[PDB]
Design a protein around this motif. Structure first.
Motif, short mmCIF file in Angstrom:
data_model
loop_
_atom_site.label_atom_id
_atom_site.label_comp_id
_atom_site.label_asym_id
_atom_site.label_seq_id
_atom_site.Cartn_x
_atom_site.Cartn_y
_atom_site.Cartn_z
N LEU A 1 0.83 -1.20 0.00
CA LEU A 1 0.00 0.00 0.00
C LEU A 1 0.86 1.26 0.00
CD1 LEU A 1 -1.42 0.76 3.56
CD2 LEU A 1 0.77 -0.32 3.03
N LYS A 2 0.36 2.32 -0.62
CA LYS A 2 1.08 3.58 -0.69
C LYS A 2 0.41 4.64 0.17
CE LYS A 2 0.98 7.18 -4.01
NZ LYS A 2 1.35 7.79 -5.31
N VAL A 3 1.06 5.02 1.26
CA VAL A 3 0.53 6.03 2.17
C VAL A 3 1.19 7.38 1.94
CG1 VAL A 3 -0.06 4.35 3.95
CG2 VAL A 3 2.20 5.44 3.96
N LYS A 4 0.37 8.41 1.72
CA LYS A 4 0.88 9.75 1.49
C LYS A 4 0.23 10.75 2.44
CE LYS A 4 -2.06 10.00 -2.58
NZ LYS A 4 -2.82 8.98 -3.35
N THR A 5 1.05 11.44 3.22
CA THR A 5 0.55 12.43 4.17
C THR A 5 0.37 13.79 3.51
OG1 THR A 5 2.68 13.29 4.99
CG2 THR A 5 1.88 11.21 5.93
N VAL A 6 -0.26 14.71 4.23
CA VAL A 6 -0.50 16.05 3.71
C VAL A 6 0.81 16.81 3.53
CG1 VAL A 6 -0.73 17.15 5.96
CG2 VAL A 6 -1.86 18.15 3.97
N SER A 7 1.89 16.26 4.09
CA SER A 7 3.20 16.89 4.00
C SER A 7 3.93 16.42 2.74
CB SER A 7 4.03 16.56 5.24
OG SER A 7 3.92 17.58 6.21
N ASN A 8 3.20 15.77 1.84
CA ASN A 8 3.78 15.28 0.60
C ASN A 8 4.77 14.15 0.87
OD1 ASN A 8 3.32 17.31 -2.05
ND2 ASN A 8 4.64 15.53 -2.40
N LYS A 9 4.48 13.34 1.88
CA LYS A 9 5.34 12.23 2.25
C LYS A 9 4.72 10.90 1.82
CE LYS A 9 8.06 14.11 6.05
NZ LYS A 9 8.52 13.89 7.45
N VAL A 10 5.03 10.47 0.61
CA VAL A 10 4.51 9.21 0.08
C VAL A 10 5.48 8.06 0.35
CG1 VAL A 10 3.60 8.02 -1.94
CG2 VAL A 10 3.37 10.51 -1.74
N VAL B 1 -7.71 8.65 4.56
CA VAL B 1 -8.94 8.36 3.84
C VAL B 1 -8.72 7.30 2.77
CG1 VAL B 1 -10.88 9.35 2.57
CG2 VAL B 1 -9.60 10.76 4.20
N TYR B 2 -9.41 6.18 2.91
CA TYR B 2 -9.29 5.08 1.95
C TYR B 2 -10.48 5.06 0.99
CZ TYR B 2 -6.25 1.09 1.03
OH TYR B 2 -5.31 0.24 0.50
N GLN B 3 -10.20 5.29 -0.29
CA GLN B 3 -11.24 5.29 -1.30
C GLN B 3 -12.34 6.30 -0.95
OE1 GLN B 3 -10.41 1.72 -2.91
NE2 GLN B 3 -12.46 1.23 -3.69
N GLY B 4 -11.94 7.41 -0.34
CA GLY B 4 -12.90 8.43 0.04
C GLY B 4 -13.61 8.10 1.34
N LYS B 5 -13.22 6.99 1.96
CA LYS B 5 -13.83 6.57 3.22
C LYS B 5 -12.90 6.88 4.39
CE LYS B 5 -15.97 4.70 0.79
NZ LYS B 5 -17.05 4.76 -0.23
N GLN B 6 -13.49 7.04 5.57
CA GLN B 6 -12.72 7.34 6.78
C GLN B 6 -12.77 6.17 7.75
OE1 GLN B 6 -13.04 11.54 7.99
NE2 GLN B 6 -15.00 11.62 6.90
N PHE C 1 -4.11 7.80 1.80
CA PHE C 1 -3.77 9.20 2.02
C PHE C 1 -3.99 9.60 3.47
CE2 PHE C 1 -5.62 13.54 2.29
CZ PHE C 1 -4.44 14.24 2.15
N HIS C 2 -2.90 9.91 4.17
CA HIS C 2 -2.98 10.30 5.57
C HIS C 2 -3.14 11.82 5.70
CE1 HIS C 2 -1.85 6.22 6.09
NE2 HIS C 2 -1.48 6.33 7.35
#
Length: 78
Positions: free
Chosen positions: A3-12, A45-50, A68-69
């Protein structure tokens, strides 16, 4: 699995080894523990879900879902 997790800080971060016990809980817990303390909300948020913590093992059946974190901390910093 992967899985690819990306934070609001642009940390993928792209990993190819997810657990089946916590999956999301383990990932979020490892990030908070690594920094020592929680950023603020630490909610992705996974697939627009929380809320995916409940889908620990259920998330292991994905092994191909973008993550996306989100972390908003505007309380104080001094």
């Amino acid at each position: 699995m992967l899985l690819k997790v990306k934070t609001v800080s642009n940390k993928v971060i792209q990993i190819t080894s997810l657990t089946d016990d916590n999956t999301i809980a383990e990932l979020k817990g490892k990030l908070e523990e690594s920094e020592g303390i929680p950023g603020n909300m630490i909610r992705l948020v996974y697939q627009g879900k929380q809320l995916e913590d409940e889908k620990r093992l259920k998330d292991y059946q994905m092994s191909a879902g973008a993550t996306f974190h989100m972390v908003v901390a505007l309380r104080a910093g001094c």
